[PDB]
Amino acid sequence: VPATRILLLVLAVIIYGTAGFHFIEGESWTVSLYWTFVTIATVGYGDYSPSTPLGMYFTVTLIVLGIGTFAVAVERLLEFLI
Amino acid sequence: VPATRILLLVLAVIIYGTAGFHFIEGESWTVSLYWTFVTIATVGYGDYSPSTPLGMYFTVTLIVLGIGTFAVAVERLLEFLI
Amino acid sequence: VPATRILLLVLAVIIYGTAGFHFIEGESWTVSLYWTFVTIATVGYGDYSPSTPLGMYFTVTLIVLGIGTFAVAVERLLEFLI
Amino acid sequence: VPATRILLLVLAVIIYGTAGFHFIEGESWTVSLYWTFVTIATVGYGDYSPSTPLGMYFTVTLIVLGIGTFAVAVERLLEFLI
Ligand SMILES: [K+]
Ligand SMILES: [K+]
Ligand SMILES: [K+]
Numbered sequence A, B, C, D: 001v002p003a004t005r006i007l008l009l010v011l012a013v014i015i016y017g018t019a020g021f022h023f024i025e026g027e028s029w030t031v032s033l034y035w036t037f038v039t040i041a042t043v044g045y046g047d048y049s050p051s052t053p054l055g056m057y058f059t060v061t062l063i064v065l066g067i068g069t070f071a072v073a074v075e076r077l078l079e080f081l082i
C-alpha cells in the first residue's frame, strides 16, 4: 500500500475510535482521542476504559480494526523519517 | 495458513479465553469476552484481571496461546480489507 | 535460531523476571511469575507493578531483554502447533 | 539501518519521553524514565499516566515516535545477543 493511503486509513480509524468513545462512554473529545491512540497502539494504561456493554463491544471493534492499521502506519512512518 | 483456517483458530482462542475467565474468575460472559480480546491484543487495561491463582495460571496459558494467534489473524484481516 | 534454543532463552528470561520481582518487590513466587508473563507479553494490566526505584530499574531491564525474546518464542510456537 | 544508529535513535526517544513527562506531568526523573520505557514498549501498566491535556497530547506524540523505534531497537539487540 502507498504510504499516503495508509495515513488516510489510520486517520479514519482514529476518527471512528474517538467519536465512538465520546458518544458511547461520554468522555470529552480530547480524552477520547487520547484513549483511541492508547488503545490502538496496545499501550492500554486503563486510566480510561469502557464501562458499558455497548462500549465494550465498540472497543473490541476498534481493537480488531485499529491495531493492525496502526502497526502498518508506524512501520511506514519509520521509513519516511529514518 | 489459509485465512479461513486462521479465523477458526482465533475463534477457538476467543471461546477458550471467555469461558475460562467466566468460570474461574466469575465475571459475566460479556465482560469475559471483552477481557479476552483486551488480553490477546496485548492492550491490557487492567479494569479486569484474574485475582485467583488458577485465574493467573489460566491467563498465562491464554497469553501464550492467544497473542500470536491474534497477531496472525489481524495481519490476514488487513489483506482482505486493504 | 533452533526452536529449542529459543525455548531455553525465554525460560531464562522468565526465571530472571520472576526471581527479581519476588525479591525486589516482595510479591509471592506465583504472583511474580504471572507478572513476568504479563510484562514480557506487553499486556501490562497494572494489577502488579514495581513501586521501588530498584524495582523500576529492574523492570526496564526485563522489558529490554524479555519482550523480543518472548515475541520470537511465540512466533516459533506458532509453527510447531499450526 | 546500522545497529548503532538505531541505538542513538531510541536513546533520543527515551530522552524526549523522560524530560517531557517530568516537566509536563511533574513526576520525578526516575519515575519519568520508567514510564517512558513502559509506554514505548507498549506495556502500559497505568501506575503512571498523563492527567493534563498537554500531557495527553505529548503522550500521543511519544507513542507515534517511540513505539516503532523501540521495536526496531529490540529486534536489533536480539541479533547482537543471540
Ligand atoms: K499493554
Ligand atoms: K496495559
Ligand atoms: K512484527
Ligand SMILES: [K+]
Residues within 6 Å of the ligand: A041, A042, A043, B041, B042, B043, C041, C042, C043, D041, D042, D043
Ligand atoms: K502491548
Ligand SMILES: [K+]
Residues within 6 Å of the ligand: A044, A045, A046, B044, B045, B046, C044, C045, C046, D044, D045, D046
Ligand atoms: K493497565
